[PDB]
Amino acid sequence: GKAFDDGAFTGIREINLSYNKETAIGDFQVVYDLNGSPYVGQNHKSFITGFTPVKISLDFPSEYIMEVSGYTGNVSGYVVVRSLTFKTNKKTYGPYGVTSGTPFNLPIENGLIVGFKGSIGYWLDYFSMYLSL
Template sequence: MDKTVTKTVVKAEPQQHHHGSTSAAAELIAVGGDPESLICPKCLHRLKPPVFQCAAGHLLCTTCRDELPEKNECASCFFTTATGYTRCYGVERILQSIRVVSHNAIRGMLVCNEKEEHGKMSPSQAGNEQRQGPPVKLGPCGGDGGGSWKVDVRGISRIVKVRVRHAAAVDAIAVMYERDGRKEWTKRWGGSGGKRSEICLQPEEYITCVKGHIGYYNDWFVVRSLTFVTNLRTFGRYGEAEGAPFQLPAAGGRIVGFHGRSGNLLDALGTYVRMDV
């Protein structure tokens, strides 16, 4: 599933009325949210205050920040700044205000988008989602050019093949998935330039990390190179090692999908990680 839409209940502060009195009880407001946005991209655990962010806005939990060998280097984009990580008080206030309520606890809390998504899932897909939980969304790393895209990862058991077009930068990427026993190709994300390389994974092989470089090429901030690491071997480098290094590790899980931005080149790339159970 590309995005798990849930309902949370946010406890609002007691409201001050115009005549000076305060309401006796705090107001409970039902809001929609994406739980993937509240996960530390390094350890893949739920964020808890204190929360830190780099200059580019990437979040990190306090445990992972304390374990960084270089405190001024971002663990997601690997940019180095003089200030390093700083406290993200806005996210901390949001985390402290959220009270998660199950869908069974409040009648009618399931929103329309979630009803539609659940209606599309086969029994086997729903069973896998319940056992494994939704995939974790990491990234994307790169620029904000091009158009955004993502993959519906429901029912995907593994990535079978990856095609990369590359030269001085990464021109495009396409992926073959195995979903409910059937193999299917995605569309090509990016342009038709560069050399085409194809990665073929063995039946028991899965991608554990995607890394590379992001930087400027012809005045566009794009993905300059990609390397794919599996549980068995390493593929690449595809493109040129120019710009800032980045990596998107699965941290004990496996990468089952991608999302990003592209035009004539691959502007940005992110991953969906499924944690093994």
């Protein structure tokens, strides 16, 4: 898939992703906070369409992500991120996608997610996160 790297920012304001309850996660785009100002990240899109869009608006700066979990699995022979869930200090968003395969979760005692990077072909191949104090 096509790789992407948004880099790091001051925080996260909104997350826009899409999925298919039969395959995996599709598009991914984030609206970060850049020193108090909204910064619209580049929209990373799937090579195909047919996904269901989902918008996750966070109550910045009082609401922030505390944990990220999901499933990675096999789809058409490719290992991809099939499901994703974002738990903040105020609410839980998801799961989105197919909750099948091998689970993974990232709880954060101290710190913030300040950036995303990954790859997207037909689906989200993989992703990593930037952590900061």
